[PDB]
């Protein structure tokens, strides 16, 4: 029997059940066809080895199908089942590719979509040391620091290296006394035999509108180890899957007055949830009349303005950023500047282009360049990216252009005809790149655009700035009976 | 940006006034080109007048009493 009267944690740690589980996982790894007679873990392991990836994905539902007992042992004591599965997948790969020992000699099995998607505020003490799947935005990430994995010291009085202790992520490892000269003292690490591993810490927090209904949004920590680091950037929407592990902290105990422990998710699989063949496009482009058919595809709701639709469509794909052979550096970015009385769906034209485009960002004019910032986690005074370097190849959607400040105005013009920023800040003197197309909308003075004056008067903008824009669309309005019905009905 | 001539600006860190030598102090013997001679800040235009007059800029304000030799050439374009 593979279920006897012990604790699930200590059943699997016994030699008998350990070997039984070990052999049970191999038979599933080798023989598992999926609706077509394909050993999926024969082609998948291959596609992993054609890239040197040392990370194998195990969809949970099939594990439950082909295996009834392991898929119930798993989320109870996953600090050891996910260790046994490692040694199983190893011996499988080293059979399908007997030389792979020259590539990292260690395999980690991830796990995909446990059936228990959860919230980030409903984690209580019931889930300590249990596999968990969650969701939410990530709002920080330190740098990829190296952490000890198999440390090995050396004694200061005998030139002998102590034992290879392993490092657990709750307490600094403690070497004993030298078994060669009994010289118990302050040993130092031995950088040459020690093994290291990547490390990164992130702070995930609840999605904005998903669950934060009538309260504030909670947050949690996560620790990405070797293969996972740099799987996600501030702003991404991810969905962790990891042991929910606690550890003792002495500070919280001195603030709350009670014995209170900190918690952290040792992530085990990170799968982003965001936005990521020609033979049709051939004839679709060869229609010779794709212009009309594409113009009325952008601005999906807002009626009218097939004039400005044209210009914005021209802007979206762009143009050609040719390099002049006379060292003159002509730019290949189309910048637009809307304008018009309030209530004419300018802001919607901005927001829809936020969606349809790619790698786009957004801002208001009421943060434009990189600035010194004290990191939430690392507590170092680093430099953070602004709002014109996050569109280094895409678009930059400026809103409330008028409300910009004098520093903001003197900083925006530099990037138009040079497309390159220098930062001689308190941090350090750098010169970075910024190649973005600017899409902004100003306002008419006096609450209404009046076309007696030139446009350079109702815009309220510095004159050498309007020259840095290619298109100047003017939105206007008039009481027109036949269009009142057209807009109302819509 | 900072301006053409020197300014006295309240530094966030120091909470006090510091001195900003503009362009005409960085151009040593060089040449400075200007357009739209009515757009420059009133104070700045006064100071450029005095700088072409004396060939140096001397601000005596809140905590600043210094001198900066302006040695450059003005090529102005009017409207």
């Amino acid at each position: 029997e593979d279920l006897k009267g012990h604790s699930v944690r200590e059943w699997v740690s016994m030699a008998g059940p350990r070997l039984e589980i070990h052999h049970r996982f191999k038979n599933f790894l080798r023989t598992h066809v999926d609706s077509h007679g394909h050993n999926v873990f024969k082609e998948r392991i291959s596609d992993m080895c054609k890239e040197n990836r040392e990370s194998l994905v195990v969809n949970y539902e099939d594990l439950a199908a082909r295996e009834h007992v392991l898929a119930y042992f798993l989320p109870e004591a996953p600090a050891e089942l996910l260790q046994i599965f490692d040694e199983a997948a190893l011996e499988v790969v080293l059979a399908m590719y007997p030389k792979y020992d020259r590539i990292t000699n260690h395999i980690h099995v991830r796990i995909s979509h446990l059936p228990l998607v959860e919230e980030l505020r409903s984690l209580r003490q019931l889930h300590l040391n249990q596999l968990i799947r969650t969701s939410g935005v990530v709002t920080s990430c330190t740098g990829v620091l190296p952490q000890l994995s198999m440390v090995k010291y050396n004694c200061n009085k005998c030139n002998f290296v102590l034992g290879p202790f392993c490092q657990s992520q709750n307490q600094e490892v403690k070497p004993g006394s030298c078994p060669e000269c009994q010289s118990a003292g302050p040993f130092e690490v031995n950088m040459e035999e020690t093994i290291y591993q990547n490390y990164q810490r992130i702070r995930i927090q609840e999605s904005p509108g998903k669950v934060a209904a009538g309260r504030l949004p909670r947050s949690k920590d996560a620790i990405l180890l070797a293969d996972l680091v740099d799987s996600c950037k501030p702003g991404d929407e991810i969905e962790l899957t990891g042991i929910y592990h606690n550890n003792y902290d002495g500070s919280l105990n001195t603030a709350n007055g009670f014995p209170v422990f900190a918690t952290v998710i040792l992530a085990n699989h990170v799968a982003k949830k965001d936005n990521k063949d020609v033979k049709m496009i051939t004839s679709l482009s060869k229609d010779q009349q794709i212009g009309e058919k594409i113009f009325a595809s952008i601005a999906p709701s807002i009626y009218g303005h097939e004039d400005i639709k044209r210009g914005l469509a021209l802007a979206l794909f762009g143009g050609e950023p040719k390099n002049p052979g006379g060292k003159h550096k002509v730019r290949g970015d189309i910048n637009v500047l809307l304008c018009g009385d309030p209530g004419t769906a300018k802001s919607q034209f901005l927001k829809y282009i936020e969606k349809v485009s790619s790698r786009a960002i957004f801002t208001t004019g009421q943060g434009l360049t990189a600035y010194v910032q004290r990191h939430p986690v690392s507590r170092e005074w680093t430099l953070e990216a602004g709002a014109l370097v996050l569109a280094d190849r895409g678009v930059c959607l400026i809103d409330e252009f008028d409300k910009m400040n004098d520093q903001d105005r003197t900083s925006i013009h530099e990037a138009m005809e040079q497309q390159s920023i220098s930062i001689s800040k308190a941090g350090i003197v750098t010169s970075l790149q910024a190649r973005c197309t600017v899409i902004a909308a100003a306002n008419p003075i006096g609450g209404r655009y009046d076309p007696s004056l030139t446009f350079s008067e109702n815009v309220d903008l510095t004159e050498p700035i309007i020259s840095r824009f290619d298109i100047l669309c003017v939105v206007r309005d008039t009481v027109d009976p036949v269009q009142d019905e057209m807009l109302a009905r819509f | 940006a900072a301006g053409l001539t020197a300014s006295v600006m309240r530094d966030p860190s120091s909470r006090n006034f510091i001195m900003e030598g503009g362009a005409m102090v960085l151009a040593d013997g060089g040449v400075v080109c200007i357009d739209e001679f009515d757009k420059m800040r009133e104070d700045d235009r006064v100071a450029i007048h005095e700088a072409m007059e004396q060939q140096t800029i001397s601000i005596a304000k809140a905590g600043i009493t210094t001198t900066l030799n302006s040695r450059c050439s003005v090529l102005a374009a009017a409207n």
């Binding site: 740098g143 200061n156 302050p186 130092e188 950037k233 790698r359 990189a370 430099l383 953070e384 990216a385 370097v389 996050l390 280094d392 190849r393 350090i428 750098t430 970075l432 790149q433 | -």
Partner: protein
């Protein structure tokens, strides 16, 4: 300091010619004079020194995966 020399405080025993390791790693002064616990100080007159700077290297601009600020070492 590359080749450093120390001296006891009370009994005035010297232990010289000690060689530092290169890079950014210090040195662990003894505590067993052969005198109080850590009786050793550095003799500033006898310590050979060499210069050292510390730069900061930013990654080339055309190799950033284009979502963020370049990393440095």
């Amino acid at each position: 300091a590359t080749r450093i020399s120390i001296q006891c405080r009370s009994c005035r025993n010297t232990l010289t010619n000690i060689a530092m390791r290169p890079g950014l790693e210090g040195y662990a002064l003894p505590r067993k004079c052969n005198c109080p616990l850590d009786p050793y100080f550095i003799m500033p007159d006898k310590c050979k020194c060499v210069d050292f700077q510390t730069l900061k290297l930013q990654e080339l601009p055309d190799a950033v995966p284009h979502g963020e600020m370049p990393r440095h070492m």
